[PDB]
Amino acid sequence: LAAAAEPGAGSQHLEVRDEVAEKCQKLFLDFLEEFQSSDGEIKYLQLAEELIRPERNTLVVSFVDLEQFNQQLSTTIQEEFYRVYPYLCRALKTFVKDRKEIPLAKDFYVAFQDLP
Amino acid sequence: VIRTSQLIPEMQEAFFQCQVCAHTTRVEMDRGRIAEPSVCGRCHTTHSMALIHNRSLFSDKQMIKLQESPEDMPAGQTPHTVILFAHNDLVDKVQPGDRVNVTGIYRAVPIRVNPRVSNVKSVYKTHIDVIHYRKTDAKSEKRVELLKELSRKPDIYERLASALAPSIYEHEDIKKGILLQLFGGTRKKFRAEINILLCGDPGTSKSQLLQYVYNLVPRGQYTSGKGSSAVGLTAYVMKDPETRQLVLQTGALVLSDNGICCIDEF
Ligand SMILES: [Zn+2]
Numbered sequence A: 001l002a003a004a005a006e007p008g009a010g011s012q013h014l015e016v017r018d019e020v021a022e023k024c025q026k027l028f029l030d031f032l033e034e035f036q037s038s039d040g041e042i043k044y045l046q047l048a049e050e051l052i053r054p055e056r057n058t059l060v061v062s063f064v065d066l067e068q069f070n071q072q073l074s075t076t077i078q079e080e081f082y083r084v085y086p087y088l089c090r091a092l093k094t095f096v097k098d099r100k101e102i103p104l105a106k107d108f109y110v111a112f113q114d115l116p
Numbered sequence B: 001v002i003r004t005s006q007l008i009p010e011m012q013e014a015f016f017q018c019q020v021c022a023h024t025t026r027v028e029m030d031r032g033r034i035a036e037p038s039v040c041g042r043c044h045t046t047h048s049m050a051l052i053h054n055r056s057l058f059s060d061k062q063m064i065k066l067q068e069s070p071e072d073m074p075a076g077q078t079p080h081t082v083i084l085f086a087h088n089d090l091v092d093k094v095q096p097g098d099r100v101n102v103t104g105i106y107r108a109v110p111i112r113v114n115p116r117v118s119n120v121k122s123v124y125k126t127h128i129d130v131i132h133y134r135k136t137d138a139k140s141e142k143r144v145e146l147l148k149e150l151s152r153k154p155d156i157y158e159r160l161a162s163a164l165a166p167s168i169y170e171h172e173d174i175k176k177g178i179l180l181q182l183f184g185g186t187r188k189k190f191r192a193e194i195n196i197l198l199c200g201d202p203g204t205s206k207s208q209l210l211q212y213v214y215n216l217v218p219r220g221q222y223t224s225g226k227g228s229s230a231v232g233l234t235a236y237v238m239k240d241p242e243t244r245q246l247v248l249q250t251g252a253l254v255l256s257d258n259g260i261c262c263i264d265e266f
Helices: A019-034 A043-052 A065-067 A072-078 A081-099 B139-152 B154-163 B173-184 B203-218
Strands: A058-062 A109-113 B007-017 B024-028 B047-052 B059-066 B079-088 B099-110 B113-115 B115-119 B125-135 B221-224 B236-240 B244-250 B261-264
Touching: A019 A043, A019 A065, A019 A072, A058 A065, A058 B024, A065 A072, A065 A109, A072 B047, A072 B154, A081 A109, B007 B113, B154 B173, B173 B203, B203 B221, B203 B261
Parallel strands: A058 A109, B079 B125, B221 B261
Antiparallel strands: B007 B024, B007 B047, B007 B059, B059 B079, B099 B125, B113 B115, B236 B244
16 A cells, blocks of 8 residues: 555544544643642542442542642633543543543543532 | 513524534524525535524513502403513513513514414514613611711610601500611521510400511511512412422511511411
8 A cells, every 4th residue: 555545444533623622631631640649649530430430420529639730620610610630531531541440331420519 | 561471592694604614604593493404615515504502692681561550450450461572681670570670662563373383473563672660569887877976865765666667656665676676686596586476366466566667677588477468478389380490488587597587467
């Protein structure tokens, strides 16, 4: 095959992408990966360990922790919540796959507590 | 106002997204209808644009059923009623039982004969597109210093007990007890609520005194001990008629959680 090996073979791809929602996705993934507890390191990694159980699929996240991470991100999640929510779920899925024991078809959910 | 409906979300801008290629577009409401795109501009697939309900934009709307005032009725006639519609920023400003001078546009709209058929009845249903409400029956450091000076007045206790119920005669200790009830004890089981019982013949001043004093305090309630009471003493569960779902209708004793409950014919 030539270097032009892609006729768009079998593609019905997304011709446009939600920029705000995907920025929220990556920044929330960074928040889950980097926000740390005072009595240790990386709180939500430890809390996400519990999601390998068959019944557990929801990670409960503190909105004030998100604000302590970054105010612009928290404001965007609060203002654009329903728009960005499945993208946050994809961020959690990307974060929790590193436990390596999850079923491939399992859905994961984010749940924001402590809204001021 | 007889009844006031739930807050109706009324659409004002329809958000469409292509199921194939995620291209999005927005279209204004024309006259309640939507000009659905029929083909996606970024991939030309027909019937591929889908309405995303929660990405669309909505305004507030509410239905209010208004009855003519009793004095305005003709002799012995049953009430006429009109339907009102109040939109964004004017939506939830009236409650059932209150009185209003309401200004609006007298609309007339067709009503369809059946929900699945576009034929309309020749007789148009009418309603008021509300523009303005005016409630007609609802109605500082200077106050603080006036009250502080008045507290030092001699026999202020007797003064306030005499100010209670001017129409009622000679019942000094009864009014004094009612005053102490209305002030109440110190909150903090350490119940601070003072309980008072009036006892006497029918037709005497006690019923008038109760009907007076219940409106003299915030959070107050008045009800009958009989089954004809509008709001009962006991909590109960009923089907809310406008939606036919269960609602926990609490009693007067619970609605007066930090006020006086006046129980007549106790
Ligand atoms: Zn498209």
